[PDB]
From a paper:
Reversibly switchable fluorescent proteins (RSFPs), such as rsEGFP2, can typically be converted between a fluorescent ON state and a non-fluorescent OFF state using specific photon wavelengths. They have been widely employed in super-resolution microscopy and imaging;36−42 rsEGFP2 in particular is a β-barrel protein that can be switched from its equilibrium ON state to the non-fluorescent state by 488 nm light, whereas the OFF-to-ON transition is achieved by illumination at 405 nm. In the fluorescent ON state, the chromophore is found as the anionic cis isomer, while the neutral trans isomer is responsible for the non-fluorescent OFF state. The motivation behind incorporation of chlorine in rsEGFP2 is therefore to obtain a construct with photoswitching capabilities that resemble those of rsEGFP248 but that can be investigated to confirm either HT or OBF.
Crystals were pre-illuminated with a 488 nm CW laser in order to photoaccumulate the OFF state. To obtain a ground-state room-temperature structure of the Cl-rsEGFP2 OFF state, dark data was collected in an interleaved manner (1:5 ratio) with the pump–probe data throughout our TR-SFX experiment. To account for pump laser scatter during sample delivery and to model a more accurate dark structure, a dataset was also collected with a negative pump delay (−5 ps). Minor populations of a twisted trans syn (named trans-TW) and of a cis anti species were also manually refined to occupancies of 12 and 14%, respectively, as well as the accompanying alternate conformations of residues H149 and V151. The trans-PL and trans-TW species we observe here have been previously reported in room-temperature crystal structures of rsEGFP244,52 and in cryostructures of Cl-rsEGFP248. In Cl-rsEGFP2, we observe the prevalent configuration to be trans-PL and presume that the transition from the planar to the twisted form is no longer energetically favorable due to the steric hindrance introduced by the bulk of the chlorine atom or to an electronic substituent effect. This is also in line with the finding that an enlargement of a chromophore pocket residue (V151L) can shift the OFF state equilibrium almost completely to trans-PL in non-chlorinated rsEGFP2.52 The states observed in our dark OFF-state structure are shown in Figure 3b. For the scope of this time-resolved study, we expect that any observed photoinduced species result from the trans-PL-to-cis reaction; since the starting population of trans-TW in our dark-state structure is below 15%, we expect that any photoproduct resulting from photoexcitation of this state will not be detectable in our data.
Author numbering: -5 to 65, 69 to 231
Write the structure that this text describes.
Amino acid sequence: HHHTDPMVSKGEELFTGVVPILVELDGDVNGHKFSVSGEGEGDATYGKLTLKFICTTGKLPVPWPTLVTTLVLCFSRYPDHMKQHDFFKSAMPEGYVQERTIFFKDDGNYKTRAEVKFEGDTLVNRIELKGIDFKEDGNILGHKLEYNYNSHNVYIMADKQKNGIKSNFKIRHNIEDGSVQLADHYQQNTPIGDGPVLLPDNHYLSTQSKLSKDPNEKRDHMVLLEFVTAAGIT
């Protein structure tokens, strides 16, 4: 609402209230083609997301928790003293590309590319996902993961050469038998536009996610509440 840096003001202004979100994913995992649509709202003031996702092609062929990181970090809450480090909002409204490779230990990998940008007043995240080399009897295609999600801190670093950011981090998915399925993420983000962006000092994001079901919904779906806060600069 009041920042002495006009570049920060420009990005904050687009995220000042509740912003509607649309998520589209087209996926192919070991030749099972599927699509997911999601709708909800983001409130960057509190770092809060609320989304509901539907598999529009029938039953989702992989477990919903494996898609949480893939299915909008511009809604992170950056403390006032860290707002000059917020790459994600500084790239708006033209947006950014978010690319990942996700390696599931002892199993296959996801390769994702997403464009995150405004269409009018709506923040859209449009994703293509390709998954290969998964085991039919593994934890992913065998749906052995529990329907829950662990809190996680992720380290963000600038990539000055690409005018973007980079991160590598591990997600632990609980398996029904009490064990864990590791998912190693590599991520890079680059701006879509050619204007300047804020390139951050090293810092981390703290995330927490809660998964639930809509008791009146017959389609395969996931309801997601996420909180993300930046930290690590004193």
